[PDB]
Amino acid sequence: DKAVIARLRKGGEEFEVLVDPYLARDLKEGKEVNFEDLLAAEEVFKDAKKGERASVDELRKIFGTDDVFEIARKIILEGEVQITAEQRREMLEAKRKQIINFISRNTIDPRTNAPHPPSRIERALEEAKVHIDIFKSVEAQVKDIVKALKPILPLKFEEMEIAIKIPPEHTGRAISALYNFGGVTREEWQRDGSWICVMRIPSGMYGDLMDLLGKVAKGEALTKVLRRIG
């Protein structure tokens, strides 16, 4: 009873599969999913609660194939995943969090070129009554959300390129930490033991980069803002 029914009406018939609701959510978002884990039974049902299985001949007729994996994919994508009220709440809470974190990191308020705390984006989501879609990725719904937020919270998606030089003593620590932060481009070791790159980062993550650099090169790293990319 961990599995939930996903259901699709096709050609005057009902078809059901029994799936892990989180992995089904992942598939509808466009993530890669392990079908052996997704499916609780490798079967298409006419009625899963009664154990009435769909015949191979009916599947070929309606779906054009008898492959349970391909048919499960269609049912999940085109049909309805019957998650519980408590799964839905939990998924909604997790998705809203990811949206909030992504907006906070990938935008700046043009009233300092700085980023709103998560808490301010959260209140703004409440106040504009933004619909959160649990079966879409952040990336696929965030444009629409930011547009619903424009009236009461102004936000621009901005990136920056920032030239970095790390002196020879501090490379062992700094380089590896910068790759871990992400955004390293045009990296070049220098004959004197130093190393340079251009970091391409979400403008909301500037202050976080600058703190990382303080830590890992003890305030000896040199930087230069090359451009902001609106």
From Swiss-Prot:
InterPro entries: EFG_III/V, Ribosome_mat_SBDS_CS, Ribosome_mat_SBDS_N_sf, Sdo1/SBDS, Sdo1/SBDS-like, SDO1/SBDS_C, SDO1/SBDS_central, Sdo1/SBDS_central_sf. Pfam families: SBDS_C, SBDS_domain_II, SBDS_N. Coiled coil: none annotated. It comes from the Archaea. Gene3D superfamilies: 3.30.70.240, Ribosome maturation protein SBDS, N-terminal domain, SBDS protein C-terminal domain, subdomain 1. GO terms for biological process: cytosolic ribosome assembly. Signal peptide: none annotated. NCBIfam families: RNA_SBDS (TIGR00291). Belongs to the SDO1/SBDS family. This is Ribosome maturation protein SDO1 homolog. It comes from Archaeoglobus fulgidus (strain ATCC 49558 / DSM 4304 / JCM 9628 / NBRC 100126 / VC-16).
